[PDB]
Design a protein. Structure first.
Length: 141
């Protein structure tokens, strides 16, 4: 329904009702079929596809802040994972008379969910001691 859809699509209708990022628990019944042969990959693989190692000789201290990693891929409006300085979803204070505003269709279906985070760095107070020094001498004779 971007310009002029021939048939009414359920996805597009939901988008029409809301144009903001939100959770969607609506039912789906997609279908697909494929089974192509795997590639020969004759070339060498000296470097992995997905890196999983890190090594920094010089330590860094970029303040005590570690934002969570989030991804996007749906009909819902695409926005950055950290919109700290991107106002739009939260309007400024105001007191205008409320107008008859109601929506449902199928997208929104009584939802909210909860989330929370809490992580602390591990610590220890022990180390290997191969040296014991069984022998001891100081005073003469």
């Amino acid at each position: 329904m971007s310009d002029q859809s021939q048939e009414p699509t359920m996805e597009e209708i939901l988008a029409s009702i809301r144009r903001i990022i939100s959770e969607d628990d609506a039912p789906a019944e997609p279908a697909a079929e494929a089974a192509p042969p795997p590639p020969p990959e004759p070339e060498p693989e000296p470097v992995s596809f997905d890196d999983e190692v890190l090594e920094l000789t010089d330590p860094i201290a970029p303040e005590p802040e570690l934002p969570p990693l989030e991804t996007v891929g749906d009909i819902d409006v695409y926005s950055p994972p950290e919109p700290e300085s991107e106002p739009a979803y939260t309007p400024p204070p105001a007191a205008p008379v409320f107008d008859r505003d109601e929506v449902a269709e199928q997208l929104v279906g009584v939802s909210a969910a909860s989330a929370a985070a809490s992580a602390f760095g591990s610590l220890s107070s022990a180390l290997l001691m191969p040296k014991d020094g069984l022998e001891h001498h100081h005073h003469h004779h």
